[PDB]
């Protein structure tokens, strides 16, 4: 029941600084090396380096010597990645990964922290209800920045028949749609609500779907 849990998505302007965290649980933090891996959108994995969690000594890959700093808070079982003087192409999901060294491999990974570096403003989504054996209802999650958003239906109680589609991007705003398919005999007599979260703006929106 070992886990690595990272901090959430962030939007920063070029020139600013960000600190991403990776909290280990289920083992002694100071006994395994913690590695950092960059994945730019649509690109491969790039090893950034690692930090010795006992001594606090960081080792950087050459492409990450300069603006990058690895540090620790051992009492919190947490590793940190700081990036200074941010550039657009620092936009990426960053993963922490534990290395075991019978075998040598990356055995546990954090979920990723998605960093967007842009001059565009944080923008919460506008959420619109989409009404027309089964009926398909929807929610349009329009014009948010940065990624990502999460969508559930009836607070997660409605899971079967839910399809959430990939976002599109245009002029520094993302849009996506989510749908749920329910029996026609149950709507509108039984209420259906989409729940949208946009972590980077700390917003949550509920929208009831009612007939149009």
């Amino acid at each position: 029941s070992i886990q690595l849990v990272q901090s959430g998505p962030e939007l920063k302007k070029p020139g600013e600084t960000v600190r991403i965290s990776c909290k280990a649980s289920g083992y002694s933090f100071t006994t395994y090396g913690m590695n950092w891996v960059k994945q730019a959108p649509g690109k491969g994995l790039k090893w950034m380096g690692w930090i010795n969690t006992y001594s606090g000594v960081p080792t950087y890959a050459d492409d990450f010597k300069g603006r990058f700093a690895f540090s620790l808070e051992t009492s919190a079982s947490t590793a940190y990645l700081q990036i200074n003087i941010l550039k657009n192409e620092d936009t990426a999901t960053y993963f922490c990964a534990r290395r075991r060294s019978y075998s040598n491999y990356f055995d546990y990974w954090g979920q990723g922290s998605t960093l967007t570096v842009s001059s565009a403003k944080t923008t919460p989504p506008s959420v619109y209800p989409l009404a027309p054996s089964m009926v398909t209802l929807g929610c349009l999650v329009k014009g948010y920045f940065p990624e990502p958003v999460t969508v559930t239906w009836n607070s997660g109680s409605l899971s079967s028949g839910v399809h959430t589609f990939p976002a599109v991007l245009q002029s520094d705003l993302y849009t996506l749609s989510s749908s749920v398919t329910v029996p026609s005999s149950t709507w509108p007599s039984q209420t259906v609500t989409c729940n949208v979260a946009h972590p980077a703006s700390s917003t949550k929106v509920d929208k009831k779907i009612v007939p149009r």
Partner: protein, 217 residues
Amino acid sequence: QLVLTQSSSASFSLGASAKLTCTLSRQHSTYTIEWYQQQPLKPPKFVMELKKDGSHSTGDGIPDRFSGSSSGAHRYLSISNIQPEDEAIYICGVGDTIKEQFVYVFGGGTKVTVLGQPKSTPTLTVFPPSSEELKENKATLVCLISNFSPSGVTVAWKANGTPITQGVDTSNPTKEGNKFMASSFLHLTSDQWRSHNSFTCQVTHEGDTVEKSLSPA
């Protein structure tokens, strides 16, 4: 001077013996490598460690149709009876220690597609703008495209049966079950929505086109 070379993509027929190659730099031809698998919006996951003599150990969550083989600087990941669930990006990696300094390098990754699956025509679901959006003087038309295989589609929109390209944004496909889905949006002003007799979402899949329309009236 560690380098790992991988082709960027590979395709295999369903149920065939698939083989992916990762090649070490010449001077590192004897090195042990690691294979990882990665899916959308998820971190990579360890598949196996593979030595120069072909011996290997496989990771958590990996079924035994996966095996490793080696020849010279080449390291192979094989998948017996390859299944659609095996579609992913496979990335090799290699570590070394140099004057007490650890160094690690990932290959570029190979995206694997499984061909020869049963074909499936897209289902279209269209939605008109909400009254809420219309009050903001805007209209987004939504075309949800689902239940299709293989994953390639093109999407066009028509207004009164004439092509409309301005304001169209179409998503990449994503995998649901074994099949795929995508979305397309047509961004209009509320006046444009109200002024046309019809708007049509037109989806081409495997060279065949299906259409579904919205009528403002």
